[PDB]
RNA sequence: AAUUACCGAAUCUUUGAACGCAAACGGCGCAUGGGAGAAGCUCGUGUCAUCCCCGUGCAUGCCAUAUUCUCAGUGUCGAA
RNA sequence: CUCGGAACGUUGCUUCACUUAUCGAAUGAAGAGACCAAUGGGUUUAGCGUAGUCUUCGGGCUAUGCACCGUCUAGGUUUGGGAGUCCCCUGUGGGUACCCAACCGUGCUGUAAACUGAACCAACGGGAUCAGUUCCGGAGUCUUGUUUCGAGACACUGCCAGAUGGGGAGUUUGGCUG
RNA sequence: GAUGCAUCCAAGUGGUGUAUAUCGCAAACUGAUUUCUGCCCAGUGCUCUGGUCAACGUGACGAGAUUCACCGACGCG
RNA sequence: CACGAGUUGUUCGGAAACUGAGCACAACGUUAUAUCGUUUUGUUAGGAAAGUGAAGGUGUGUCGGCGG
RNA sequence: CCAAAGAAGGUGUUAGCCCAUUGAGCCAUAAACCUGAGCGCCUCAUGAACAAGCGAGUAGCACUGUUUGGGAAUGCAGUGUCAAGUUGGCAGGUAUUUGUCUGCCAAAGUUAAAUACAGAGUAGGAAGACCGAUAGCGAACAAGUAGCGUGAGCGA
RNA sequence: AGACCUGAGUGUGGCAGGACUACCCGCCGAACUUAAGCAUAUUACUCAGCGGAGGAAAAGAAAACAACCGUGAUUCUCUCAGUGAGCGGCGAGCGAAGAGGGAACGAACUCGUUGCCGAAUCGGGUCUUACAAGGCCUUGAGUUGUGGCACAAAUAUCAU
């Protein structure tokens, strides 16, 4: 089918062409172990379900009706910041301790600027493998980005280790990231053809050297 | 003025080909894995005539390389092809008349027909009756074979393009005088609506640039430019020379 | 069903068979060929005419021959079974 | 917010990264149909600016129009009359390609109401516009005060009457005062005012 | 149970955007309900093969939708 | 005035190599390439070093090794190893003449003067649970991916410019006057 | 010699000769044998080898518009 | 001219129900504009247009066969 | 003799009183309409007091075409090129470069009335210094009829 | 296995299609004619052609005029004005706008943005006499953002 052919040829073209650093930075994702650890933390601090929020608000209403003088806070339990607008606000206000950005968002321009904003505001950020995996962590179908703003004392050590391992890959390698171009990757058949051609012309010019 | 007949013929209409009673396109068999690596053996079942063509056609029966069935290709027969003959098509086919071989496997100086201009083209050169190409040389650096075409031109083609061995049947059709407008009528009946031919000087100025005058003459030179618009490009188109050729015919065509 | 009008199955044959014919040829066929001539629905079937004769006049039609007249009506020649008298059925219908 | 970043990123259309994205997208679009239904807009910021909401009843279609000037469809380029009206190739359509794309979408899908459209891509031969359409039979649309108006009959095929933004652009309604005095409310209306012969009763 | 006038309720053949498919054809379907059946069976009584009849649905595109229907992809992951 | 160079960034052309845009073919997009191994790829196939050079101290980045991805073959030719003619009647029937490595080879069971036979819906063998019941190979495997082939960043697409262009369009082709 | 020649068409992955393949397609002229077809390339065509001719570029004066120089293809010579 | 009649089919002709020169619905492109193009050289459409089923699973009815 | 009625239609000649008409009124009503945003009830809403941003292949600009009274270009279209926003932009009807002033804030959207009905409809009205059967509509009448043309059409 | 991205099939619920077309909105678009010829011009941004609405349509809430002592969305009328505007083989011809007197007018609102929120949103079930602008439930859609509050006619909103 035409859609199958086009989805394969699109990947072929993206590998063959010269990819500027701003787009190539999404190819160099966080490693598998730290990605799993970050997803574990995000799933632990996932937002509450519709039912859970509704029950919490019902309980708040009952605590209000018990006596109007006592004021009960309606704030939700501590969770991750989810959504492009909310995550952008957290980064801009420098409230986020660690940001996670999916690498397969299309249109890419939704999050193409996010690593640079995180670098400018000096917030640790990681680029991970799937918005689908982020959505599974947060209870939705997909998620462009997720921001951890605070954790509990039990998870503070995990957050610090995650921040260090993430900074190893992304924030401390800013000079390399800003300059590394991607693409220009040959096909397997082209690489084999080049190798065989070099082998054929290995020693043709041996008689032109004086030694 | 009115539209010229040479431009009216481009609309199709009643000037198309009389394809009824024709057996179909005459092509070599497809360039499959068997042709590219080994060979296929087929049996010539029948030799037939197609209306509008001066050469004989051969119905050659092959087995399907992937299915339990038979294929029955229809090709232009080289001269000498007979019913019951075995035709071998592929890389490992022997050099015999009627066999289809890649042009790189055919010796220099060989006479071939049904030559492919491109690999897989299924044959487009040297297909008129009595016509053939001559293999001049091979170039293994670039992988190309040089041929002398029926017109006398030289053409370089990829060495993977196939070619049949021999000349096309029905050769010598043009040496018999027709002698009769009726014979010409029956000849063109199976080809198309192109006969009889009225001279441009015999028409009126409205339809043709050559028409008109109290004497039957072309007022202006009959050699026209290559950039002339349609309706004006009638006569001798972009002629490099005119008159009776003396001292040797040149090879016609672009360089 | 998007069609909600009440349609009765017991009155269908009154539409199939309209009225008999009393012309010279029609009455000539009654006595000798056991044949009754009727004007029937123009969109009717020979099988439906055979069934309508059974439902209306309680007779068996061994053959029906239909023709559309030059004036647009449809005329059926219905030959009754030999067990039935076409003259008796014509008398019951009301033509003689 | 994120809108500012997307807006500046799409204002930087000649940069290396945006040229790469647009080249890949133009190839992908070139290998598709003339009209293509999309789940989500390619430019959500522009779509939301022009009226799109991520609600039920809103649709986005990418429409392709060939580029270049108009050719007068006269037989063999032969025109009869004054030499003034003799050009066959140098004439230009008095309607823009965005309006043409909107009209093609609206004429193809007559059960939808065309709201707006925006430029997404163009190459040497094609030009792509994303057209926002609304379903007038959707309860979400029919009960929303902000898109309710499009359910009315005066808005049927507004893109064919030139009431969309591109239609207003090529009608000249982008200008007011001395710049559009003969074009308001329309050039036909101004012509009627200026050319009708008025016969007062007592004169 | 006059007849006029007016209208809220009903009927409304064959077509036609005409839309199951055709068409100088009162043609021919496929589902899904009915009907009539003088062969056969059953005990004129049922029931009824072939046949014949009738109602309803069935164009194409789009949009929404699926108690969250069934799938495709050397698309991206993720198991294994 | 002219001429000579760097050693830089940039670039106007341009050779040559390439392939992904594009173009030309063919095909029922029916067998491409590799395995024969880089001037290859992986920190979701980058593991182990080394030397610089950085670092947000978590790690990189440049070179440069080594390892992995990643392998199987018809046939040809020669190197090692083991290892099983018989019936009936001279005839007949049935059977055996292996394996391994290397190198070449390169996907390879058929012909080479042709003169009209047939071939489908597997036999069979392994592994688990005679025959089931499943797997597996028979019938190699792999994929930085492209249906294949030929071209290939030119000629293919717009727009702007100039020539040419009765092929066609519009118009005109004074007056006085024995 | 086919990514061809002629040519349709407002346009397109559009159309005809072409289900073709130089013993073929397309465009002219003369008009069966037979016997022949002289001389002329100046003109006008057609055709094939090394000053001027557009846009675009490139630089410069000037506050800039403007300007100027340079480059510039068929074609024509 | 008026009035009243007249055309009877299992097998006749057509249709159901073949292909031809052809046409052009879909599809796809094009067009300000579909009321345009393509649509048989085996044959639509960059094109997922097969609703049909060879075996064998399993039940059901009609056989033969085996033993009991 | 009537007139709060003289109104102009009918009826065998020219009718206020022959007839119908010519007026207050009366009666009956799906919904909608209108009426302390008519008025209850239930439900559901709801009023008053107790720092940064603002619409980008857009606006320009060049070339070409077109349109305009718009003229060193009034709008628009094609293609090229393409902003500003920290002398921010746009307009101020002679092109340029300045620097002052004024008005305004483009590139999403909705909106009633006053306006058209220059060969439309639906349900009604009022008519006329109009035409009067070769006129006025083609058609005062079984007129887009009869008839005519292969047809588009034509048409008494 | 599975996801979600892209794309199919089917069920279910809808809608488009034609007519009309006087007026109105978008395109496309002549020529006869006039210039005592004719090519620019004129006819005419007209006829014919192709789309699309409605009882009207379109326009419409200032990137507006102006240069005032200023005015204040649109539309229409008289006037400006056949113009000591302009345009034009400056020929034939063509040709507006501001101001002023009026008609109309409860005339204004909505989104994106930016701040602050963040599913409070939307469909679908079910219930309330209710396909409630209500309750309850619902992954169904939506976090690639639905909804709220405040932006000059403004100066908080949010409780109780
Ligand atoms: K002829
Ligand atoms: K175009
Ligand atoms: K012309
Ligand atoms: K005005
Ligand atoms: K897959
Ligand atoms: K290729
Ligand atoms: K002779
Ligand atoms: K000459
Ligand atoms: K030259
Ligand atoms: K009277
Ligand atoms: K200012
Ligand atoms: K409006
Ligand atoms: K009007
Ligand atoms: K009216
Ligand atoms: K005159
Ligand atoms: K005009
Ligand atoms: K006023
Ligand atoms: Mg003549
Ligand atoms: Mg001529
Ligand atoms: Mg002559
Ligand atoms: Mg002559
Ligand atoms: Mg009959
Ligand atoms: Mg135009
Ligand atoms: Mg206006
Ligand atoms: Mg039908
Ligand atoms: Mg390390
Ligand atoms: Mg490293
Ligand atoms: Mg490195
Ligand atoms: Mg002669
Ligand atoms: Mg001579
Ligand atoms: Mg008669
Ligand atoms: Mg018959
Ligand atoms: Mg045919
Ligand atoms: Mg064809
Ligand atoms: Mg009240
Ligand atoms: Mg009240
Ligand atoms: Mg622009
Ligand atoms: Mg003009
Ligand atoms: Mg003008
Ligand atoms: Mg603005
Ligand atoms: Mg009056
Ligand atoms: Mg008369
Ligand atoms: Mg009359
Ligand atoms: Mg008359
Ligand atoms: Mg018109
Ligand atoms: Mg009104
Ligand atoms: Mg309106
Ligand atoms: Mg004018
Ligand atoms: Mg919003
Ligand atoms: Na043909
Ligand atoms: Na002549
Ligand atoms: Na292929
Ligand atoms: Na000419
Ligand atoms: Na002429
Ligand atoms: Na003339
Ligand atoms: Na000659
Ligand atoms: Na002659
Ligand atoms: Na001749
Ligand atoms: Na000469
Ligand atoms: Na020069
Ligand atoms: Na009165
Ligand atoms: Na319509
Ligand atoms: Na006024």
Query: What is the rounded distance in angstroms from the CA atom of residue C74 to the CA atom of residue B2?
Result: 61
Q: In 3-state terms, what secondary structure has residue C43? A: coil
Burial B13-47, CB ≥16 within 10 A → b, else e: eeeeeeeeeeeeebbbbebeebbeeebbebebeee
Q: Give B183's contacts (C-beta < 8 A, 6+ positions apart).
A: none
Token pair for D193: 């005012």
Consult the annotation and say whether B217 binds a ligand. yes
Long-range CB contacts for residues A167-171, cutoff 8 Å, separation at least 24:
A167/A124, A169/A28, A169/A30, A169/A31, A169/A34, A169/A126, A170/A30, A170/A115, A170/A124, A170/A125, A170/A126, A170/A127, A171/A118, A171/A119, A171/A122, A171/A124, A171/A125
Resolution to 1 decimal place, in Å: 3.0
| CB contact A89 to D (< 8 Å) | yes
According to DSSP, residue C6 is labeled -
Specify whether the CB–CB gap between B40 and B62 falls below 8 A.
yes
| CB contact A120 to D (< 8 Å) | no
Specify whether the CB–CB gap between D38 and D130 falls below 8 A.
yes
Nucleotide nearest D133, from its CA to each C1': E63
Protein residue closest to E14, using CA and C1': C43
**Angle formed at CA D197 by CA D194 and CA D202, multiple of 5 degrees:** 125
According to DSSP, residue C11 is labeled G
Specify whether the CB–CB gap between B7 and B230 falls below 8 A.
yes
Token pair for D61: 């279609």
According to DSSP, residue C2 is labeled -
| Backbone φ and ψ of B250, nearest 5° | -85, 165
Q: Give B142's contacts (C-beta < 8 A, 6+ positions apart).
A: none
| Backbone φ and ψ of A24, nearest 5° | -70, -25
Q: In 3-state terms, what secondary structure has residue C9? A: helix
According to DSSP, residue C10 is labeled G
DSSP labels, chain D: -HHHHHHHHHH-TTSHHHHHHHHHHHHHHHTS-SEEEESS-S-HHHHHHHT--SSTTEEEEEEEEE-S------GGG---S-GGGG-SSS---SS-HHHHHHHHHHHH-TTSEEEEEEEEEE-SSEEEEEEEEE-TT-HHHHT-TTTGGGGSGGGTTHHHHT-SHHHHHHHTTT--GGGSSTTSS-HHHHHHHHHSPP--S--
Token pair for B120: 């897989």
Q: In 3-state terms, what secondary structure has residue C89? A: helix
Q: Give A84's contacts (C-beta < 8 A, 6+ positions apart).
A: A110, A111, A144, A145, D2
Query: What is the rounded distance in angstroms from the CA atom of residue A77 to the CA atom of residue A49?
Result: 12
- Partners of B61 in the β-ladder: B43
Residues of D in contact with A120 (CB under 8 A): none
Query: What is the rounded distance in angstroms from the CA atom of residue C86 to the CA atom of residue C80?
Result: 6
Specify whether the CB–CB gap between B67 and B131 falls below 8 A.
no
Judging by beta carbons within 10 Å of its beta carbon (0-12, 13-18, 19+), is residue A138 exposed, middle or buried?
buried
According to DSSP, residue C70 is labeled T
Token pair for B62: 């092959």
State the SS3 of chain A. CHHHHHHHHHHHHHHHCEECHHHHCCCCCCCHHHHHHHHHHHHHCCCCCHHHHHHHHHHHHHHHHHCCCCCCCCCCCCCCEECHHHHHHHHHCCCCCEEEEECCCCCHHHCCCHHHHHHHHCCCEEEECCHHHHHHHHCCCCCCEEEECCCCHHHHHHHHHHHHHHHHHCCCCHHHHHHCCEECCCCHHHHHHHHHHHHHCCCHHHHHCCC
| CB contact D39 to A (< 8 Å) | no
Interface present between D and A (3 or more CB pairs within 8 Å):
yes
Q: Which is it for the CA torsion A180, A183, A187, A191, positive or negative?
A: negative
Q: Which is it for the CA torsion D39, D40, D42, D48, positive or negative?
A: positive
Nucleotide nearest D51, from its CA to each C1': I108
Long-range CB contacts for residues C35-39, cutoff 8 Å, separation at least 24:
C35/C77, C35/C78, C35/C79, C35/C80, C35/C86, C36/C77, C36/C78, C36/C80, C36/C86, C36/C89, C36/C90, C36/C93, C37/C75, C37/C76, C37/C77, C37/C78, C38/C75, C38/C76, C38/C78, C39/C73, C39/C74, C39/C75, C39/C76
A8 CA from E63 C1′ (Å): 30
- Partners of D63 in the β-ladder: D35, D129
Token pair for D143: 């009960």
Specify whether the CB–CB gap between B64 and B72 falls below 8 A.
no
Q: In 3-state terms, what secondary structure has residue C1? A: coil
Query: What is the rounded distance in angstroms from the CA atom of residue C22 to the CA atom of residue C25?
Result: 8
D73 CA from J35 C1′ (Å): 32
Instruction: Please state, in angstroms and as integers, the Cα–Cα distance from residue D134 to each residue in A21, D51, D157, following that order.
Output: 39, 10, 12
Q: Do A88 and D1 touch (CB under 8 A)?
A: yes
C45 CA from E22 C1′ (Å): 22
CA of D196 to the centre of ligand 41 (A): 28
- Partners of D116 in the β-ladder: D132
Judging by beta carbons within 10 Å of its beta carbon (0-12, 13-18, 19+), is residue D170 exposed, middle or buried?
middle
Q: In 3-state terms, what secondary structure has residue C41? A: coil
Specify whether the CB–CB gap between A68 and A85 falls below 8 A.
no
Burial A96-117, CB ≥16 within 10 A → b, else e: bbbbbbbbebebbbbbbbbbbb
| CB contact A113 to D (< 8 Å) | yes
Consult the annotation and say whether B208 binds a ligand. no
Q: Give A100's contacts (C-beta < 8 A, 6+ positions apart).
A: A38, A42, A125, A126, A128, A134, A145, A146, A147, A148
Residue of D nearest to A89 (CA): D1
| CB contact A78 to D (< 8 Å) | no
**Angle formed at CA B178 by CA B174 and CA B179, multiple of 5 degrees:** 150
In the sheet where D113-122 sits, what is the strand order? Answer: D35-38, D58-66, D126-134, D113-122
Q: Which is it for the CA torsion D26, D32, D33, D37, positive or negative?
A: negative
Query: What is the rounded distance in angstroms from the CA atom of residue B236 to the CA atom of residue B243?
Result: 11
Specify whether the CB–CB gap between D70 and D91 falls below 8 A.
yes
Judging by beta carbons within 10 Å of its beta carbon (0-12, 13-18, 19+), is residue B116 exposed, middle or buried?
buried
Specify whether the CB–CB gap between C41 and C16 falls below 8 A.
yes
Place of tokens 């092809």: B81
Query: What is the rounded distance in angstroms from the CA atom of residue A28 to the CA atom of residue A20?
Result: 13
Query: What is the rounded distance in angstroms from the CA atom of residue A28 to the CA atom of residue A35?
Result: 13
Nucleotides of F under 7 A from a protein CB: 18-22, 24-35, 37-41, 43-44, 54-61, 107-117, 119-120, 143-151, 157-160, 163-170
Residues of D in contact with A88 (CB under 8 A): 1-2, 5
Q: Which is it for the CA torsion A77, A79, A85, A89, positive or negative?
A: positive
Residue of D nearest to A84 (CA): D2
């Amino acid at each position: 089918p035409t859609f199958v052919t086009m989805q394969r040829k699109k990947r072929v073209l993206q590998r063959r062409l010269k990819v500027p650093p701003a787009l190539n930075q999404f190819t160099k994702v966080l490693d598998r172990a730290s990605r799993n650890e970050a997803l574990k933390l995000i799933k632990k601090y996932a937002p509450e379900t519709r039912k859970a929020r509704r029950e919490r608000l019902q309980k708040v209403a009952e605590e209000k009706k018990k006596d109007p003088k006592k004021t009960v806070s309606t704030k939700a339990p501590l969770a991750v910041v989810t959504g492009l607008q909310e995550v952008t606000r957290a980064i801009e206000k420098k409230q986020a301790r660690m940001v996670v950005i999916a690498n397969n968002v299309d249109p890419v321009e939704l999050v193409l600027w996010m690593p640079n904003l995180c670098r400018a505001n000096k917030i640790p950020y990681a680029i991970v493998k799937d918005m689908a995996r982020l959505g599974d962590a947060i209870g939705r179908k997909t998620a462009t980005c997720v921001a951890l703003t605070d954790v509990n004392a039990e998870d503070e050590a995990t957050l610090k280790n995650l921040i260090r391992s993430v900074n190893a890959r992304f924030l401390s390698r800013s000079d390399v990231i800003r300059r590394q171009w991607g693409g220009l990757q040959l096909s397997l058949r082209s690489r084999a053809e080049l190798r065989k051609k070099h082998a054929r012309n290995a020693g043709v010019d041996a008689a032109a050297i004086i030694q | 003025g009115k539209t010229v007949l040479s431009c009216r013929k481009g609309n199709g209409s009643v000037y198309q080909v009389h394809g009824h009673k024709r057996l179909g396109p005459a092509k070599l068999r497809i360039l499959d894995y068997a042709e590219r690596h080994g060979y296929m053996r087929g049996v010539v079942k029948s030799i037939e005539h197609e209306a509008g063509r001066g050469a004989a056609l051969a119905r050659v029966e092959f087995r399907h390389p992937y299915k339990f069935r038979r294929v029955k290709e229809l090709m232009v027969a080289p001269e000498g092809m007979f019913t019951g003959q075995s035709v071998f098509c592929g890389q490992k086919a022997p050099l015999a008349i009627g066999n289809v071989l890649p042009l790189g496997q055919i010796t220099e100086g060989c006479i071939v027909c049904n030559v492919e201009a491109k690999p897989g083209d299924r044959g487009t050169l040297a297909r008129a009756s009595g016509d053939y190409c001559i293999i001049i040389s091979h170039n293994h650096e670039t992988g190309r074979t040089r041929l002398k075409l029926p017109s006398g031109q030289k053409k370089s083609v990829p060495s993977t393009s196939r070619a049949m061995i021999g000349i096309i049947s029905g050769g010598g059709r043009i040496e018999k005088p027709v002698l009769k407008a009726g014979n010409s009528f029956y000849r063109f009946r199976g080809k198309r609506n192109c006969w009889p031919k009225v001279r441009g000087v015999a028409r009126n100025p409205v339809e043709h640039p050559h028409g008109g005058g109290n004497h039957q003459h072309i007022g202006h030179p009959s050699t026209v430019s290559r950039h002339s618009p349609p309706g004006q490009k009638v006569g001798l188109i972009a002629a490099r020379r005119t008159g009776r050729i003396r001292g040797g015919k040149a090879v016609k065509g672009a360089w | 069903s998007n069609r909600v009008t009440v349609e009765s199955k017991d009155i269908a044959a009154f539409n199939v068979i309209r009225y008999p014919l009393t012309t010279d040829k029609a009455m000539k066929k009654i006595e000798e060929n056991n044949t009754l001539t009727f004007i029937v629905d123009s969109r009717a079937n020979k099988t439906e005419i055979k069934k309508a004769m059974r439902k209306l006049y309680q007779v068996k039609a061994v053959k029906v021959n239909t023709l559309i007249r030059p004036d647009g009506l449809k005329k059926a020649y219905i030959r009754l079974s030999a067990a039935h008298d076409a003259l008796d059925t014509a008398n019951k219908i009301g033509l003689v | 917010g994120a809108f500012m970043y997307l807006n500046e990123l799409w204002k930087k259309k000649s940069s290396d990264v945006m040229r790469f994205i647009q080249r890949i997208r133009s190839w992908e679009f070139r290998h598709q149909h003339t009209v293509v239904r999309l789940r989500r807009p390619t430019r959500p910021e522009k779509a939301r600016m022009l009226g799109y909401k991520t609600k039920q009843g809103f649709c986005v279609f990418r429409v392709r129009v060939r580029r270049g000037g108009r050719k007068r469809p006269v037989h063999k380029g032969i025109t009869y009359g004054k030499p003034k009206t003799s050009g066959v190739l140098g004439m230009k359509l008095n309607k823009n390609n965005q309006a043409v794309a909107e009209q093609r979408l609206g004429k193809r899908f007559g059960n939808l109401r065309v709201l707006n459209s925006y430029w997404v891509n163009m190459d040497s031969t094609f030009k792509w516009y994303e057209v926002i359409a609304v379903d007038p039979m959707c309860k979400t649309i029919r009960r929303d005060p902000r898109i309710n108006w499009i359910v009315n009959s005066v808005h049927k095929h507004r893109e064919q009457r030139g009431l969309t933004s591109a239609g207003r652009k090529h009608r000249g309604l982008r200008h007011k005062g001395h710049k559009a005095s003969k074009l308001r409310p329309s050039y036909r209306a101004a012509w009627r005012r200026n050319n009708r012969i008025v016969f007062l009763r007592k004169r």
